[PDB]
Design a protein around this ligand. Structure first.
Ligand SMILES: *[C@@H]1O[C@H](CO)[C@@H](O[C@@H]2O[C@H](CO)[C@@H](O[C@@H]3O[C@H](CO)[C@@H](O)[C@H](O)[C@H]3NC(C)=O)[C@H](O)[C@H]2NC(C)=O)[C@H](O)[C@H]1NC(C)=O
Ligand SMILES: *[C@@H]1O[C@H](CO)[C@@H](O[C@@H]2O[C@H](CO)[C@@H](O[C@@H]3O[C@H](CO)[C@@H](O)[C@H](O)[C@H]3NC(C)=O)[C@H](O)[C@H]2NC(C)=O)[C@H](O)[C@H]1NC(C)=O
Ligand SMILES: *[C@@H]1O[C@H](CO)[C@@H](O[C@@H]2O[C@H](CO)[C@@H](O[C@@H]3O[C@H](CO)[C@@H](O)[C@H](O)[C@H]3NC(C)=O)[C@H](O)[C@H]2NC(C)=O)[C@H](O)[C@H]1NC(C)=O
Ligand SMILES: *[C@@H]1O[C@H](CO)[C@@H](O[C@@H]2O[C@H](CO)[C@@H](O)[C@H](O)[C@H]2NC(C)=O)[C@H](O)[C@H]1NC(C)=O
Ligand SMILES: *[C@@H]1O[C@H](CO)[C@@H](O[C@@H]2O[C@H](CO)[C@@H](O)[C@H](O)[C@H]2NC(C)=O)[C@H](O)[C@H]1NC(C)=O
Ligand SMILES: *[C@@H]1O[C@H](CO)[C@@H](O[C@@H]2O[C@H](CO)[C@@H](O)[C@H](O)[C@H]2NC(C)=O)[C@H](O)[C@H]1NC(C)=O
Ligand SMILES: *[C@@H]1O[C@H](CO)[C@@H](O[C@@H]2O[C@H](CO)[C@@H](O)[C@H](O)[C@H]2NC(C)=O)[C@H](O)[C@H]1NC(C)=O
Ligand SMILES: *[C@@H]1O[C@H](CO)[C@@H](O[C@@H]2O[C@H](CO)[C@@H](O)[C@H](O)[C@H]2NC(C)=O)[C@H](O)[C@H]1NC(C)=O
Ligand SMILES: *[C@@H]1O[C@H](CO)[C@@H](O[C@@H]2O[C@H](CO)[C@@H](O)[C@H](O)[C@H]2NC(C)=O)[C@H](O)[C@H]1NC(C)=O
Ligand SMILES: *[C@@H]1O[C@H](CO)[C@@H](O)[C@H](O)[C@H]1NC(C)=O
Ligand SMILES: *[C@@H]1O[C@H](CO)[C@@H](O)[C@H](O)[C@H]1NC(C)=O
Ligand SMILES: [Zn+2]
Length: 902
């Protein structure tokens, strides 16, 4: 029998009731340069089963408690056993209190400790964050408990189902502000031992999970709003950011998003206030701490002067995502990390709904298709994928827990939940959702609890009928990896399903309890008219007249790609769809105009259609005004550009794209009144951004003229940038491409004085668009200079240069030559060799290039590859795949482009 302190899961013998936690960050180092925090805690817990050991989590804490590492008392008149000894077991991250007798069922105990830890700049637990305000380096104290780091700040039963109330006190410099989950109890009071410090106590939290705790000590300031129901809403940021008004957009959307969710969830916002805080360089991006949500600055702040529309979209959706969790995830919590997909998947879906409420003219809900569905299908159409569900007993270590946070959990989770809501109808979905939240409020669940409540809503009505239970359907989508391609023969109306893999030669070795068969909801449109809904049962082949067509008719499946699958047709139906798109595109919903392109290119990759059929699906684009179908083409063709931009294929390709985009460019020229005013809504603005990008990068003279004119105008009046933030990346890039050192030196000067990260990013990237070899090489020479290029931006800048067809050999030589910088950057800055390697070798598609990559690997003697070890293996395998693809596709693609480039 293994000792419990050697098991990764806590015993169930003791359950926490409530905690007092007092934390005191020391924001001045101890002269050795060490920053620390001190703390004191008392946990009150209940004995469920007799035990003579207390096992609680503790990570990187030193104990200074008088006596043993803890003091143990009984609550009320309970007697307590004497402590035998306390020890720390580092591997399983435990503090272990061995007792001389047993705790008694039904009795409550209080365990007190005093401790300290490093306030490291490690983004884990209670940690420090350094940033600049003018000449002064500022340091604040903040938290990131997700997933298993609460125990790094104080000893606790650090599993999500072991919920408790928390009384947080911060002891901090008297001129700084202290924030936590709950409002402060009142005004701060001086610390008696040293009145330079103050003591801020916070109101008791609701019953909640340790991973959602937060506390922050900083100089930050806020913009505020009180909602009609009295809920205080604040956006916190650096005093300069607040003064510039960069917190305003977030403040604008927050109230409406909270209102949307209270109604959507049929549940009041469960806290007295909402704080959201913008942290400089918060690498986790965003964390849904209950009542105190943390964001990286560029995720929460918005500058109308320099920020593009895509920046606005990022802000409203990231906010909606975190706010979604304040009910789903925080109020009702998944019992264990193996079900992380339900929590993050749900938030990743409803972020679009919440954002749509704040910005109802934007059609934001559409963006889940490009943003999540087709994104995750790329990795879920591999033999190396994995099911959404993982047995709980396989998820034990903090590393195993962290592995839950991936593209499948977030984006496939979002995709399958959106499919579920769609086939149930939103009204029915919302009813089950409300029932689930009301039943499990302040408690924990598994995904089976949601299915059961959804089933209850299904069973309480008669309109929506399903081919099986909610659970049996969802099991097909959650217990096995991947997704089917649905193939229709419109001559007969025969319809089939099979596990879709991009590599037709791939061997799947992960077994499925269902033999990779799904129960598939199938909406369809025929001649532009919605048909009756259909369910494909767990069969390989079926037939229905819904999918049988006449010679002059067409059918199209999966309206708005609500279903998590791709669709193939017989060539005749494809041709009819193409005809419809050529003659009157308005008849096919915009999302399906994108689907036709997305799916066919994937099908070509899989050898289920010829590559020419996929290309034929781009032919209609010359008349397409809307964002998504163009985006689908551009995403699908980026690999073609990557493979062929140094070959004889490139000329006809550019010419074809010039032909396709010219009318869209012309359209926006008129609509925008000679480019003076942006289109109204988000999607049209996105379309303009892509149109100008496509036009300019493919050498459309009218676009080249625009870019030169705007940049020249800017150079003649630097303080007044005439280029709208939406277009800056293209205009900057094309203009630097056309020009020489005058444009380059001007943009470099602008970069060096850039106050805002998003503008600096645009400049760094555009500078890589120079067509002068000497300018690119001189630029490369700058990438390793911290005075000129931030370390964190080094590999990104090299990759941008590599992306330039001219910079490709320059960057590859630069990387090979300077690879002797691994023992300079691995302990001091992680650097990410993996990204660099992938970026620089991205183009490789010849045996000769493979031979070069093998030769570079032949420095195996010491130096190594660091964190990019076996990312080099991925590059070698990718090159082999590229060689095979180019050989198979070169002639066919060349001839298609020549044929269709006029
Ligand atoms: C977790 O923290 C809580 C907040 O500090 C503690 O509750 C507080 O306990 C204090 C006593 O330890 C009380 O303060 C005063 O104590 C003096 C003792 O001499 C009494 O005269 C007073 O009655 C009392 N002051 C007032 C204004 O009543 C606090 O009253 C009390 N605060 C509360 C209940 O909100 C918890 O004790 C602590 N938990 C554990 C297990 O230690
Ligand atoms: C938690 O306790 C740890 C173990 O006691 C502390 O880590 C130790 O810090 C010591 C002092 O800072 C280091 O020992 C030596 O200290 C002398 C005098 O300060 C120096 O001359 C030496 O350079 C130093 N030794 C070395 C090899 O550098 C220990 O290195 C170190 N022990 C470890 C890490 O196992 C923590 O500081 C303490 N943390 C907090 C937040 O209180
Ligand atoms: C947070 O919400 C605010 C209220 O809805 C928005 O405030 C609006 O800002 C607009 C842009 O600054 C203003 O529109 C126009 O501004 C120009 C330039 O100064 C003026 O010429 C126009 O008179 C003005 N109105 C027009 C063209 O109709 C709005 O006036 C203003 N609305 C209100 C009620 O004050 C904020 O924009 C918003 N913050 C962010 C970052 O989006
Ligand atoms: C955290 O603070 C709360 C609020 O003061 C404490 O809740 C009280 O707990 C005591 C002892 O169990 C009860 O007599 C009171 O009825 C509670 N008050 C309320 C409003 O719930 C809680 O005990 C504190 N936590 C700890 C660990 O001391
Ligand atoms: C809070 O008080 C501290 C200590 O007086 C201030 O920190 C100093 O700030 C000045 C800049 O004006 C620096 O020159 C010093 O080096 C800082 N001293 C220390 C010990 O850090 C701080 O500026 C005050 N902050 C606010 C918001 O009032
Ligand atoms: C949650 O939903 C319920 C049920 O729809 C809401 O109660 C209804 O409110 C409307 C509004 O006038 C009434 O017409 C219905 O008669 C109510 N139905 C019932 C059964 O009470 C309720 O207001 C919602 N609650 C929250 C907190 O959002
Ligand atoms: C995890 O969640 C379950 C609910 O899904 C909790 O069990 C419930 O506890 C409440 C409140 O004490 C009872 O009213 C219910 O009867 C329980 N339902 C059950 C057992 O199905 C459970 O307590 C939570 N786990 C922890 C450690 O708090
Ligand atoms: C469409 O499905 C039908 C029926 O499932 C297929 O017809 C069957 O084909 C096999 C081939 O040997 C015959 O043995 C059966 O007798 C046929 N069943 C009939 C006619 O009812 C048909 O081949 C399919 N058509 C396709 C895939 O184009
Ligand atoms: C397919 O998606 C489109 C959006 O791309 C849906 O059209 C929207 O529908 C709602 C409700 O009918 C309207 O409020 C919006 O104004 C519509 N927007 C546009 C641009 O048309 C359409 O309803 C979806 N089709 C199906 C069958 O669900
Ligand atoms: C897959 O299995 C087949 C034999 O069934 C074999 O020919 C092939 O080499 C295997 N691997 C790949 C990557 O195709
Ligand atoms: C094309 O179809 C749209 C949408 O169904 C319709 O409104 C329009 O009349 C049609 N236009 C033409 C030119 O056929
Ligand atoms: Zn989330």
């Amino acid at each position: 029998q293994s000792k419990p302190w050697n098991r990764y899961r806590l015993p169930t013998t003791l359950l926490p009731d409530s905690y007092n936690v007092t934390l005191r960050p020391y924001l001045t180092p101890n002269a050795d340069g060490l920053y620390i925090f001190k703390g004191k805690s008392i946990v009150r817990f209940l004995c469920q089963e007799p035990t003579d050991v207390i096992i609680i989590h503790s990570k990187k804490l030193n104990y200074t408690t008088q006596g043993h590492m803890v003091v143990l008392r009984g609550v009320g008149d309970s007697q307590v056993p004497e402590i035998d000894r306390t020890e720390l077991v580092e591997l399983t991250e435990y503090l272990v209190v061995h007792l001389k007798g047993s705790l008694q069922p039904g009795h409550m105990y209080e365990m007190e400790s005093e401790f300290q830890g490093e306030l490291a700049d490690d983004l884990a637990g209670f940690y420090r964050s350094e940033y600049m305000e003018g000449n002064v380096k500022k340091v604040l104290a903040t938290t990131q408990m997700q997933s298993t780091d609460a125990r790094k700040s104080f000893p606790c039963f650090d599993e999500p189902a072991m919920k408790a109330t928390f009384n947080i006190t911060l002891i901090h410099p008297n001129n700084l502000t202290a924030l936590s989950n709950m409002p402060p109890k009142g005004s701060s009071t001086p610390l008696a031992e040293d009145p330079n410090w103050s003591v801020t106590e916070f109101e008791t939290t609701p019953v909640m999970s340790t991973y959602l705790l937060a506390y922050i000590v900083s100089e930050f300031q806020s913009v505020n709003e009180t909602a009609q129901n009295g809920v205080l809403i604040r956006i916190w940021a650096r005093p300069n950011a607040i003064a510039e008004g960069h917190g305003m957009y977030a403040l604008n959307v927050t109230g409406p998003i909270l209102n949307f969710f209270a109604n959507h969830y049929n549940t009041s916002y469960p806290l007295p206030k909402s704080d959201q805080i913008a942290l400089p360089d918060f690498n986790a991006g965003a964390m849904e701490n209950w009542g105190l949500v943390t964001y990286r600055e560029n995720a929460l702040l918005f500058d109308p002067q320099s920020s593009s529309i895509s920046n606005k979209e990022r802000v409203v959706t990231v906010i909606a995502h975190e706010l979604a969790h304040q009910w789903f995830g925080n109020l009702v919590t998944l019992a264990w990390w193996n079900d992380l997909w339900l929590n993050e998947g749900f938030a990743s879906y409803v972020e679009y709904l919440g954002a749509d409420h704040a910005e109802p003219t934007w059609n934001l809900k559409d963006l889940i298709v490009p943003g999540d569905v087709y994104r995750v299908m790329a990795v879920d159409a591999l033999a190396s994928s994995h099911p959404l569900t993982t047995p709980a007993e396989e998820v034990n270590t903090p590393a195993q827990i962290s592995e839950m946070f991936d593209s499948i959990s977030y984006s496939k989770g979002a995709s399958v939940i959106r499919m579920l809501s769609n086939f149930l109808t939103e009204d029915l979905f919302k009813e089950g959702l409300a029932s689930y939240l009301h039943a499990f409020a302040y408690q924990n669940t598994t995904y089976l609890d949601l299915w059961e409540h959804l089933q209850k809503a299904v069973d309480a009505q008669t309109s929506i009928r399903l081919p099986d239970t909610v659970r049996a359907i969802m099991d097909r989508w959650t217990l096995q990896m991947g997704f089917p391609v649905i193939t229709v023969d419109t001559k007969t109306g025969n319809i089939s399903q099979k596990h879709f893999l991009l590599d037709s030669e791939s061997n799947v070795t992960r077994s499925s309890a269902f033999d990779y068969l799904w129960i598939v909801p199938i909406s369809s449109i025929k001649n532009g008219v919605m048909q009756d809904h259909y369910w494909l049962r767990d069969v390989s082949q079926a037939q229905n007249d819904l999918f049988k067509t006449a010679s002059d008719d067409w059918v199209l499946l999966n309206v708005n790609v609500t279903g998590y699958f791709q669709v193939n047709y017989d060539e005749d139906n494809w041709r009819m769809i193409q005809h419809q798109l050529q003659t009157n595109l308005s008849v096919i919903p915009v999302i399906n105009r994108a689907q036709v392109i997305y799916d066919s290119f994937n099908l070509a990759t899989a050898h289920m259609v010829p590559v020419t059929l996929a290309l034929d699906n781009t032919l209609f684009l010359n008349g397409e005004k809307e964002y998504m179908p163009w985006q689908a083409a551009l995403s699908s063709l980026s690999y073609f550009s990557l493979m062929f931009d140094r070959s004889e294929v490139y000329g006809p390709m550019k010419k074809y794209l010039r032909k396709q985009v010219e009318p869209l460019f012309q359209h926006f020229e008129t609509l925008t009144k000679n480019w003076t005013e942006r289109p109204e809504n988000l999607m049209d603005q996105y379309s303009e951004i892509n149109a100008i990008s496509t036009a300019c990068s493919n050498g459309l003279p009218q676009c080249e003229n625009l870019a030169k004119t705007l940049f020249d105008q800017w150079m003649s009046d630097p303080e007044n940038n005439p280029i709208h933030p939406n277009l800056r990346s293209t205009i900057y890039c094309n203009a630097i491409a056309q020009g020489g050192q005058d444009q380059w030196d001007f943009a470099w000067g602008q970069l060096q004085q850039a106050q805002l990260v998003n503008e600096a990013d645009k400049l760094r990237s555009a500078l890589a668009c120079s067509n002068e070899v000497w300018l690119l090489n001189r630029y490369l020479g700058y990438t390793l200079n911290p005075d000129l290029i931030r370390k964190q931006d080094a590999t990104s800048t090299i990759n941008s240069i590599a992306s330039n067809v001219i910079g490709q050999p320059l960057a590859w030589d630069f990387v090979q030559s300077n690879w002797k910088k691994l023992f300079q950057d691995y302990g001091g800055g992680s650097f990410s060799f993996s990204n660099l390697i992938q970026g620089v070798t991205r183009r490789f598609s010849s045996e000769f290039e493979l031979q070069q990559l093998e030769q570079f690997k032949k420095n195996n003697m010491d130096v190594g590859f660091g964190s990019g070890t076996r990312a080099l293996e991925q590059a070698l395998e990718k090159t082999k795949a590229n060689i095979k693809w180019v050989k198979e596709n070169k002639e066919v693609v060349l001839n298609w482009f020549i044929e269709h480039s006029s």
